[PDB]
Amino acid sequence: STALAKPQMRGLLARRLRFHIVGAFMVSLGFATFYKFAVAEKRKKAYADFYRNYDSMKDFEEMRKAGIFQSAK
Amino acid sequence: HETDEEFDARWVTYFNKPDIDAWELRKGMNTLVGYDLVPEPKIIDAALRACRRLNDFASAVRILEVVKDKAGPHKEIYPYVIQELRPTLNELGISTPEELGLDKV
Amino acid sequence: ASAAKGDHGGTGARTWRFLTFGLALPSVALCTLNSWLHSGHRERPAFIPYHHLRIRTKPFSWGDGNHTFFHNPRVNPLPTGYEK
Amino acid sequence: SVVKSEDYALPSYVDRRDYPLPDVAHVKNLSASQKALKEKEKASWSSLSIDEKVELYRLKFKESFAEMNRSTNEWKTVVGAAMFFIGFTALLLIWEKHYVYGPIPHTFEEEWVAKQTKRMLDMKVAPIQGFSAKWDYDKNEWKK
Amino acid sequence: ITAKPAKTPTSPKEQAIGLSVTFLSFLLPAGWVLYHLDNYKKS
Amino acid sequence: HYEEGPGKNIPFSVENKWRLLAMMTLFFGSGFAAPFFIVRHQLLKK
Amino acid sequence: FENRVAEKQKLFQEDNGLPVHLKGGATDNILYRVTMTLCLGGTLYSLYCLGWASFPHK
Amino acid sequence: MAYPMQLGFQDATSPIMEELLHFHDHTLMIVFLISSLVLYIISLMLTTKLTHTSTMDAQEVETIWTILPAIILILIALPSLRILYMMDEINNPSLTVKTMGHQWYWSYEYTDYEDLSFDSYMIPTSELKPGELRLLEVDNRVVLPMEMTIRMLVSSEDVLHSWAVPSLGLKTDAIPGRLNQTTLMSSRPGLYYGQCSEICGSNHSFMPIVLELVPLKYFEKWSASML
Amino acid sequence: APDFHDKYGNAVLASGATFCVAVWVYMATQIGIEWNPSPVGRVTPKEWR
Amino acid sequence: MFINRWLFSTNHKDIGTLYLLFGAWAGMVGTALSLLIRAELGQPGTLLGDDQIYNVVVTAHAFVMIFFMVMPIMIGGFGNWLVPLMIGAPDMAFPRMNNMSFWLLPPSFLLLLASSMVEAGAGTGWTVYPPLAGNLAHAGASVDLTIFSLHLAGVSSILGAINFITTIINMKPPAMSQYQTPLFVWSVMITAVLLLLSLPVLAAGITMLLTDRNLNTTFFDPAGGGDPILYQHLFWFFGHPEVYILILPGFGMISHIVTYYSGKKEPFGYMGMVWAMMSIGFLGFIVWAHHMFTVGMDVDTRAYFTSATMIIAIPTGVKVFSWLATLHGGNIKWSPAMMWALGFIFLFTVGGLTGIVLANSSLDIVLHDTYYVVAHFHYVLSMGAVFAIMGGFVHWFPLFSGYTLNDTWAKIHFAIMFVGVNMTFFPQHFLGLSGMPRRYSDYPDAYTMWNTISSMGSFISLTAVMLMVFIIWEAFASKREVLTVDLTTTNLEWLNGCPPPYHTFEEPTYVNLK
Numbered sequence A: 001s002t003a004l005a006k007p008q009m010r011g012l013l014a015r016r017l018r019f020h021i022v023g024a025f026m027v028s029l030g031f032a033t034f035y036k037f038a039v040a041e042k043r044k045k046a047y048a049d050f051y052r053n054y055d056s057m058k059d060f061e062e063m064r065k066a067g068i069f070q071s072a073k
Numbered sequence B: 001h002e003t004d005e006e007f008d009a010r011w012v013t014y015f016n017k018p019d020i021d022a023w024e025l026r027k028g029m030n031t032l033v034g035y036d037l038v039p040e041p042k043i044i045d046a047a048l049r050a051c052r053r054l055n056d057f058a059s060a061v062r063i064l065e066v067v068k069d070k071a072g073p074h075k076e077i078y079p080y081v082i083q084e085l086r087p088t089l090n091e092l093g094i095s096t097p098e099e100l101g102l103d104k105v
Numbered sequence C: 001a002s003a004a005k006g007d008h009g010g011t012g013a014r015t016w017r018f019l020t021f022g023l024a025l026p027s028v029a030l031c032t033l034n035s036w037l038h039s040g041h042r043e044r045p046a047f048i049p050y051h052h053l054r055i056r057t058k059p060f061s062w063g064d065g066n067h068t069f070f071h072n073p074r075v076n077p078l079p080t081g082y083e084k
Numbered sequence D: 001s002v003v004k005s006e007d008y009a010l011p012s013y014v015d016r017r018d019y020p021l022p023d024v025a026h027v028k029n030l031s032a033s034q035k036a037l038k039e040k041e042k043a044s045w046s047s048l049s050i051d052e053k054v055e056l057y058r059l060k061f062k063e064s065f066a067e068m069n070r071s072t073n074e075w076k077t078v079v080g081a082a083m084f085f086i087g088f089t090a091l092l093l094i095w096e097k098h099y100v101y102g103p104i105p106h107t108f109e110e111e112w113v114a115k116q117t118k119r120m121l122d123m124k125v126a127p128i129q130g131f132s133a134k135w136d137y138d139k140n141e142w143k144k
Numbered sequence E: 001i002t003a004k005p006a007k008t009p010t011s012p013k014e015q016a017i018g019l020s021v022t023f024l025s026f027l028l029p030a031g032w033v034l035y036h037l038d039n040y041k042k043s
Numbered sequence F: 001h002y003e004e005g006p007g008k009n010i011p012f013s014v015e016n017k018w019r020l021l022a023m024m025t026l027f028f029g030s031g032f033a034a035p036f037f038i039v040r041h042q043l044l045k046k
Numbered sequence G: 001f002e003n004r005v006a007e008k009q010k011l012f013q014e015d016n017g018l019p020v021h022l023k024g025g026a027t028d029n030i031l032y033r034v035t036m037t038l039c040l041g042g043t044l045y046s047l048y049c050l051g052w053a054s055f056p057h058k
Numbered sequence H: 001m002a003y004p005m006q007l008g009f010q011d012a013t014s015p016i017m018e019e020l021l022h023f024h025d026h027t028l029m030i031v032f033l034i035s036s037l038v039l040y041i042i043s044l045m046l047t048t049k050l051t052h053t054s055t056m057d058a059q060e061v062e063t064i065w066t067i068l069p070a071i072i073l074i075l076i077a078l079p080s081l082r083i084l085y086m087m088d089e090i091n092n093p094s095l096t097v098k099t100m101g102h103q104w105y106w107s108y109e110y111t112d113y114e115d116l117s118f119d120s121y122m123i124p125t126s127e128l129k130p131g132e133l134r135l136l137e138v139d140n141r142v143v144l145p146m147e148m149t150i151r152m153l154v155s156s157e158d159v160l161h162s163w164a165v166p167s168l169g170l171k172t173d174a175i176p177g178r179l180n181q182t183t184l185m186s187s188r189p190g191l192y193y194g195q196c197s198e199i200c201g202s203n204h205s206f207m208p209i210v211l212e213l214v215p216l217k218y219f220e221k222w223s224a225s226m227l
Numbered sequence I: 001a002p003d004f005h006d007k008y009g010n011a012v013l014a015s016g017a018t019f020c021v022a023v024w025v026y027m028a029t030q031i032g033i034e035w036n037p038s039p040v041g042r043v044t045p046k047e048w049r
Numbered sequence J: 001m002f003i004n005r006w007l008f009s010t011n012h013k014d015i016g017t018l019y020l021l022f023g024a025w026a027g028m029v030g031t032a033l034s035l036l037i038r039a040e041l042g043q044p045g046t047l048l049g050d051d052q053i054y055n056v057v058v059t060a061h062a063f064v065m066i067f068f069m070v071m072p073i074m075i076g077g078f079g080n081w082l083v084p085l086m087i088g089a090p091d092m093a094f095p096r097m098n099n100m101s102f103w104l105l106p107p108s109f110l111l112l113l114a115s116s117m118v119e120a121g122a123g124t125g126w127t128v129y130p131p132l133a134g135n136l137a138h139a140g141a142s143v144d145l146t147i148f149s150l151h152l153a154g155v156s157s158i159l160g161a162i163n164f165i166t167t168i169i170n171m172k173p174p175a176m177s178q179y180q181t182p183l184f185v186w187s188v189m190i191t192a193v194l195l196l197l198s199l200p201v202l203a204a205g206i207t208m209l210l211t212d213r214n215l216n217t218t219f220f221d222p223a224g225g226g227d228p229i230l231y232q233h234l235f236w237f238f239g240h241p242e243v244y245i246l247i248l249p250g251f252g253m254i255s256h257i258v259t260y261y262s263g264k265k266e267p268f269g270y271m272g273m274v275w276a277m278m279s280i281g282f283l284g285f286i287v288w289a290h291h292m293f294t295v296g297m298d299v300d301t302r303a304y305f306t307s308a309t310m311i312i313a314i315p316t317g318v319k320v321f322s323w324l325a326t327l328h329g330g331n332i333k334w335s336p337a338m339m340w341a342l343g344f345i346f347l348f349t350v351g352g353l354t355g356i357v358l359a360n361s362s363l364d365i366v367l368h369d370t371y372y373v374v375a376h377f378h379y380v381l382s383m384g385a386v387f388a389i390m391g392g393f394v395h396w397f398p399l400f401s402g403y404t405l406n407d408t409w410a411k412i413h414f415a416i417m418f419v420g421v422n423m424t425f426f427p428q429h430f431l432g433l434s435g436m437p438r439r440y441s442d443y444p445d446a447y448t449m450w451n452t453i454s455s456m457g458s459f460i461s462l463t464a465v466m467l468m469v470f471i472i473w474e475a476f477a478s479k480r481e482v483l484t485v486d487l488t489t490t491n492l493e494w495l496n497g498c499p500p501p502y503h504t505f506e507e508p509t510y511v512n513l514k
């Protein structure tokens, strides 16, 4: 209501850049964590789960029964 | 590397040179607005008085324009500047761009 | 060859400093990295008392006469084999 | 409005927010009235009327900062025209499909695809994630 | 950049002509060859 | 000496925009058409 | 031999407007026309050979 | 084999192909991050009225934009080279099979004991049995034992070819006068498809590879059956 | 004074987007293009052997 | 006078104009070939024929785009027009030899045309590997005409390289050091050194293929003790430098365009940009065998080539971040040229990154000779080299011609092209990861959706090409003559007006040493 106080007048561009480069880092950090869960670990779990109790003979017998093979009717 | 205070003082001295010529006035303002800052009121004050000594009213208005422009979205800088310059604006009879309607398309 | 670079006009200190920091020292840094990756001891091989190796025609003039000057117990066997 | 061609070798006027004080005045050749205004300008600016101050400004500068910084409706034309030409491209594709391309192979027929799909599930194509992983081998249906 | 006004302005109608001619000059010969592909693979 | 200035430093005339349009159409069109006609030539050859 | 370079300097600096490849005189024009005729004719001939080689022949 | 609308790698059928899947995930995360940072910074540079047009000093910031990419490159190269040397390790196989590329089909030789050889041709679309795969089936598949280390030797009797099976992570060029070796190990039975991967003329698109992976006892039965 | 974009930009944008969407939708759905979508959730497997 | 001016030229500007016209015409030919490619693949089955006609088209597409469109436009066109102006020189060092570099190119192109008209064409790939390219699998004249086409293009560029290096070293103002010359001039100098050193090796290799085909040598024939893989080494010792040759003048133009339309007097980090281009040029000579990771090389060699290839990312990233830092703080002018350059920075970066994926020889086993590679190089070529070409063309067209373009039309053109190239090439990453091979006229059914979309994208880019032609016509039709441009104090090529007089700098600039 009285006199206006002096705002920051120097280095406004540099201040904006610093704030948003830091912000971009945080988002990158964030996204790296998302990707590890949703992609890399997801894929590691899917292969580990598939094989943990996988029965390759049983798999073959199912395929053989369906007629898929030339050499094993 | 100089302090802000030593930078500002060089620029005040620059514009306060009594026989500054038109070329030096333009060189000064055109160089200053290249920096990452809005010039301190004490600098603008000296540049406006150089305009007076060079009988150049239009450049005085233009200098207020570029001060506002250099603040970008920081809307509080220009009213603070104008407040700090109002004594000089009154003494020299400088109308602001807004008072002249030069702020509307 | 013209190598693959290409910057004359009147050779000078500035160009050679450019080469020093922009090519020479980076190459040293790369080779320093490469070497620190491949360091780490290698298995010392079985000792075999080959007669063309561990030559002793006269005792060395230091030590007990039987140790080379930069003898490394880990990788340099004596004529009788690796030390304990 | 058709200017000079020694202009390239002479200082010229520019409206540029980072070059606020151009090398020449907007108006080079002054009228008698304008010359008189410039004389008045050597006296106190307080004695200048608003209308006269604007005219001093317009002798020196072409556009004010607000004027030179104005946004435009051009993006509407650009985006709309681009979509028109991308739309026109689909007419080329329709033409190509009608007059150039013949039938695709019989392996795309619905019954072939149904059989092919079973044979792929029978050989457990991509069973960890890609394809058979998405079939419920117990319930004999696509996993929901 | 600054420029003089066009010496020989090209109206929207003239532009429609220039555009149409340009597009046709690309499309019609290729179109004719591609239309007749079957006619070529049999001679 | 040679002619200089806009429209004069080029091996084609821009004196008439419709003659120019014919020229440019023949120029770019012939390059774009050539591969289609070479393909047709190879297909027809044998 | 004697040094007759000065007389060739006078010949090739004569202000007659001729480009350097013709400034030696009428012999230059003959050699140029021979060269260009062989080049352009040879090029036309290469085009005929393309046309012949472009179709099943022999 | 690939399936409709596939975005990524075929499901891994060998341990090395799984390693490559996990390494691709790691590298693609970095590619996505760097791509998106560059796009973001472009938008950041373009969205402010604030200006700074005088000379900027570059030295300090260029340390960061060399050191950080150098570290990223090392973080890619470390697992990349680990997998490379893994692929190369001595493994002693129990079976050697040769394949010879031809224009345009593959032949196979199993000459560890018997002298078995045969040709393997694409099934034409007009001869596919219902539900079989266009451009991918062959008349004679490469029968192989599952869960065993197999040495494949690759060459050519005419032009270059390349012998590939994407779900096993395999691609070995077929070069006349040269005998290239690769190692094959399938974790699962089944049918595994690939296609000629070096341009070789008229029917490059039409000389596929089909492996048929079966239990050892069934492989032995098949071999015995060829006497 | 109003330029080309003031006078026509709204119409160019609206008509451009409308034409583009309509023609690509037609091309994609009405002329027999085979997109070959995934059979997952779509195709009923049918006996082949 | 017309023949004297345009067939007998010794003028760097007119010779640059000839190159630009030649390269534009070649661009139409290469665009038509690319559409024939994508028409063949635009639905499953066969459209044209088997892989022979298809791969004659593919082979010609690549040769035309690289040797007759990009290099003539960037180096012959922009290089001849701009380099002398940017250093205040009155012409090139060898103004008459310069004209021969130009006139060797129509014969080179004619030989390429002839190759495709005789016999069954050269359906070899632009790599021309034996034995497919030998005299048993490619009997007859087609491959030999292709070799001769490359020989003439090679001589053209080698002599042009000698001209540019000499001009740039010898014809600057006496006060101007190499560290006062503009970045585009640097980029042409470095490109020229790469051409000088790499093309003679290509020439050796294709000459050995010619003698294997015609004089009963066996450099590449195992029956004589030769080796097909030797050809590949010789070819790629040239062919990796060649892709840096294709992009370096583009880097130089991008530096100028980004500087200009950011309202800056100078690019950020000038000496770092020089360093980065020199580093890229040097490293570009020691990485070639990353084109050969599946041929059977020893593991340690694969490790070295993986590592040396990835290190090029470091200087390249310096340039990318320096362009961003040049934008930083700018008064941005959203001109059409700026749009091309911004698209360049982002899309070149994507393509460079998938190049780094391929540098990993373990993953390259599965990605080699698939559409993943095609996606990589069309991002750096269709969306890098070409975007730099379009940005420089729109930026400097008023200098070369004296007339302005219609900026709105040019922005529309950019928008169409951006959609078209991304629709064309982004799905090709999926096709590659999922195993679709290169150089195939038809594909297993599973690959249909992305091939269909990619072919649709190729038609959108065709519409952009057609529109460009119209835009150039409109500019010459309307005749808006340039008056002034901004920033001439840091863009010397503009300071003699538009177009500059036939002779410029007859009185050289004055530059003193303080």
Ligand SMILES: CCCCCCCCCCCCCCCCCC(=O)OCC(COC(=O)CCCCCCCCCCCCCCCCC)OC(=O)CCCCCCCCCCCCCCCCC
Binding pocket: H007, H008, H009, H028, H031, H032, H035, H036, J350, J354, J418, J419, J420, J422, J423, J424, J426, J429, J430, J433
């Ligand atoms: C301008 C428009 C023109 C139109 C043409 C298109 C343009 C391209 C825009 C497209 C916008 C791209 C945004 C990221 C795309 C990732 C798609 C994906 O799911 O990728 C998956 C991976 C493999 O993944 C897998 O193995 C498993 C996938 C399935 C995950 C589980 C979910 C199951 C359902 C899947 C739903 C889909 C998920 C997507 C989720 C979506 C997340 C974003 O494929 C790949 O690696 C392909 C990677 C290619 C390498 C370049 C990467 C760096 C580009 C970053 C900027 C883009 C520039 C675009 C180029 C420029 C773009 C402007």
Ligand code: HEA
Binding pocket: H034, H038, H068, H069, H070, H072, H073, J127, J243, J244, J246, J247, J290, J291, J309, J310, J312, J313, J314, J316, J317, J318, J320, J348, J349, J350, J351, J352, J353, J354, J355, J356, J358, J359, J360, J364, J367, J368, J369, J373, J376, J377, J380, J381, J384, J385
């Ligand atoms: C303009 C042309 C051009 C350019 C510039 C490049 C640049 C690169 N290319 Fe590419 N390339 C081609 C054109 C080009 N390429 C062509 C035509 C082929 C195929 C030839 C054929 O077979 O016909 C090909 C093939 C090719 C292969 C062979 C793949 C195969 O056949 O199996 C490889 C493998 O390493 C490769 C890698 C690279 C790399 C690492 C770069 C690097 O220079 C890219 C560096 C750039 C960046 C990395 C992005 C910017 C950097 C940053 C933002 C910093 C931070 C980044 C990181 C930390 C990673 N390219």
Ligand code: HEA
Binding pocket: J020, J023, J024, J027, J028, J030, J031, J034, J035, J037, J038, J058, J059, J061, J062, J063, J065, J066, J069, J070, J124, J125, J126, J127, J374, J378, J381, J382, J385, J386, J389, J390, J393, J421, J424, J437, J438, J439, J440, J441, J458, J461, J462, J465
């Ligand atoms: C500069 C190089 C370049 C460019 C620009 C292009 C552009 C395109 N390419 Fe190209 N392509 C190659 C180089 C290039 N290509 C190479 C080297 C190969 C491998 C060959 C081999 O395997 O042996 C290849 C292979 C290749 C294939 C794989 C074939 C196969 O493996 O079977 C495909 C398929 O879609 C393809 C499609 C396209 C498309 C749709 C474009 C489109 O984006 C083209 C669109 C049009 C333009 C980009 C305009 C061009 C014109 C100008 C720029 C002139 C402008 C005029 C003035 C300024 C006056 N290309």
Ligand SMILES: CCCCCC/C=C\CCCCCCCCCC(=O)O[C@H](COC(=O)CCCCCCCCCCCCCCC)COP(=O)(O)OC[C@@H](O)CO
Binding pocket: D077, D080, D081, D084, E003, E005, E006, E011, E012, E013, E015, E016, E017, E019, E020, I003, I004, I012, J406, J407, J408, J409, J480
């Ligand atoms: C059913 C309908 C299908 C339509 C399909 C096409 C769709 C999209 C078309 C969109 C075209 C946009 C083209 C750019 C228009 C803006 C150009 C502009 O804004 O540039 C300014 C235009 O000026 C001016 O008058 C204005 C001049 C405006 C010219 C507009 C011309 C349009 C031509 C369209 C041709 C379409 C053909 C379709 C096929 C039949 C000129 O700039 P300066 O020289 O600096 O100033 C000079 C001043 O004196 C001008 O007054």
Ligand SMILES: CCCCCC/C=C\CCCCCCCCCC(=O)O[C@H](COC(=O)CCCCCCCCCCCCCCC)COP(=O)(O)OC[C@@H](O)CO
Binding pocket: J093, J094, J095, J096, J097, J098, J148, J151, J152, J155, J158, J162, J200, J203
């Ligand atoms: C398979 C069959 C393939 C056949 C391909 C044949 C290709 C081309 C036919 C060549 C016809 C050549 C005719 C003579 C050319 C002489 C050029 C020359 O001598 O150029 C000189 C410059 O090059 C210099 O010096 C540098 C030194 C001179 C360079 C001369 C090079 C001649 C070209 C040979 C091919 C080189 C390939 C190299 C790599 C393998 C002079 O330059 P100008 O601009 O003229 O003048 C400048 C004035 O100031 C001079 O007073």
Ligand SMILES: CCCCCCCCCCO[C@@H]1O[C@H](CO)[C@@H](O[C@H]2O[C@H](CO)[C@@H](O)[C@H](O)[C@H]2O)[C@H](O)[C@H]1O
Binding pocket: D092, D095, D096, D099, E027, E028, E029, E030, E031, E032, E033, E034, E035, J035, J036, J039
């Ligand atoms: C990949 C790039 C190619 C892009 C696609 C081109 C888009 C279409 C352009 C139009 O081309 C024309 O199409 C006509 C058909 O609409 C053809 O007329 C043909 O068909 C007519 C109707 O059946 C007959 O009247 C004519 O005699 C017969 O020539 C004509 O030859 C062809 O020029």
Ligand SMILES: C[C@H](CCC(=O)O)[C@H]1CC[C@H]2[C@@H]3[C@H](O)C[C@@H]4C[C@H](O)CC[C@]4(C)[C@H]3C[C@H](O)[C@]12C
Binding pocket: E011, E013, E014, E017, E021, F018, F019, F021, F022
């Ligand atoms: C369409 C044709 C050019 C076709 C070509 O370039 O291939 C040209 C030749 C002469 C032109 C005509 C006249 O010479 C000039 C007139 C100019 C008006 O502004 C448009 C119609 C106008 C009456 C033109 C119509 C059209 O542009 C014509 C008919």
Ligand SMILES: C[C@H](CCC(=O)O)[C@H]1CC[C@H]2[C@@H]3[C@H](O)C[C@@H]4C[C@H](O)CC[C@]4(C)[C@H]3C[C@H](O)[C@]12C
Binding pocket: C014, C017, C018, C021, C022, C023, C026, H059, H062, H063, H064, H066, J271, J272, J275, J318
């Ligand atoms: C010394 C030379 C030129 C300096 C000059 O005379 O102006 C400069 C120009 C580019 C610089 C290089 C680039 O900035 C890239 C690298 C940046 C790192 O911060 C140091 C090493 C680094 C490799 C630099 C070394 C050196 O400072 C270089 C090579």
Ligand SMILES: C[C@H](CCC(=O)O)[C@H]1CC[C@H]2[C@@H]3[C@H](O)C[C@@H]4C[C@H](O)CC[C@]4(C)[C@H]3C[C@H](O)[C@]12C
Binding pocket: J230, J233, J289, J300, J301, J304
């Ligand atoms: C590829 C080339 C052989 C080409 C040939 O077959 O004609 C050979 C010759 C010399 C080899 C290099 C030298 O042997 C030195 C290095 C040895 C390392 O084990 C691999 C990288 C290393 C840098 C080698 C890479 C590559 O195998 C090179 C460059």
Ligand code: CUA
Binding pocket: H101, H102, H104, H160, H161, H162, H196, H197, H198, H199, H200, H201, H203, H204, H205, H207
């Ligand atoms: Cu065999 Cu390709």
Ligand SMILES: [O-][O-]
Binding pocket: J239, J240, J243
């Ligand atoms: O070549 O990348």
Ligand SMILES: [Cu+2]
Binding pocket: J239, J240, J243, J287, J288, J290, J291
């Ligand atoms: Cu390479």
Ligand SMILES: [Mg+2]
Binding pocket: H162, H197, H198, J294, J368, J369
């Ligand atoms: Mg290969």
Ligand code: NA
Binding pocket: J040, J041, J042, J043, J044, J045, J046, J047, J441, J442, J443
């Ligand atoms: Na096809």
